[PDB]
Amino acid sequence: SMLERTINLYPLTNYTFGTKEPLYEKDSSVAARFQRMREEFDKIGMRRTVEGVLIVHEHRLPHVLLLQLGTTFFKLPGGELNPGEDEVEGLKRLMTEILGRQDGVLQDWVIDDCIGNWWRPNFEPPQYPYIPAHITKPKEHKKLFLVQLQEKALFAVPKNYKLVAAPLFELYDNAPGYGPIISSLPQLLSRFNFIYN
Numbered sequence: 802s803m804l805e806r807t808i809n810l811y812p813l814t815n816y817t818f819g820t821k822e823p824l825y826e827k828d829s830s831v832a833a834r835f836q837r838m839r840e841e842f843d844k845i846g847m848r849r850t851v852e853g854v855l856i857v858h859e860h861r862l863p864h865v866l867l868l869q870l871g872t873t874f875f876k877l878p879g880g881e882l883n884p885g886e887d888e889v890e891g892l893k894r895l896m897t898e899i900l901g902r903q904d905g906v907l908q909d910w911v912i913d914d915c916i917g918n919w920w921r922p923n924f925e926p927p928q929y930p931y932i933p934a935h936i937t938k939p940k941e942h943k944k945l946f947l948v949q950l951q952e953k954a955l956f957a958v959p960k961n962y963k964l965v966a967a968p969l970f971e972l973y974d975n976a977p978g979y980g981p982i983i984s985s986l987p988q989l990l991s992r993f994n995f996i997y998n
């Protein structure tokens with residue numbers, strides 16, 4: 802009886818958060834977001850997204866790194882795969898596009914664990930951790946992965962975003978604040994054996 806995955810965590814003060822130019826969303830509104838999902842579904846089928854969960858600690862208290870757009874939405878680092886693109890290579894590409902350095906030194910992203918799977922049945926906000934009853938053509942499949950960080954790193958945060966460290970207690974039972982995927986991270990992370998370096 803030791804069946805848990807062992808993960809190294811480092812202090813938040815081990816990481817440098819630099820700045821770079823703004824990164825703009827492909828969609829200028831909720832309505833434009835669901836119009837483009839409908840157009841691409843007709844051309845290339847189900848949307849495939851990938852998201853990274855990056856963990857740090859301070860004084861042995863785990864925190865998840867979240868992207869905050871101005872003072873509005875919280876999001877995980879991630880995005881949309883291209884057709885025929887590998888999911889793990891894709892997440893590594895997207896995390897470099899978002900947080901990768903202005904001096905063009907490469908982060909060594911380490912991805913070895915699936916956290917979870919969510920499905921969007923319609924061109925509407927609702928997402929579920931399973932394909933709902935009667936749904937044969939889901940509109941989006943989202944995959945979450947645990948990203949093991951190095952001991953130290955410099956991240957370049959686009960100037961229209963803040964990288965924030967959220968403690969697990971603040972996420973727990975807080976779907977109104979964070980939505981159904983981020984608010985269930987405490988439950989999804991509980992299986993790991995974290996080492997507080």
Ligand SMILES: [Zn+2]
Nearest residue numbers: 859860861862
């Ligand atoms: Zn301490």
Ligand SMILES: [Zn+2]
Nearest residue numbers: 920939941942
């Ligand atoms: Zn699927």
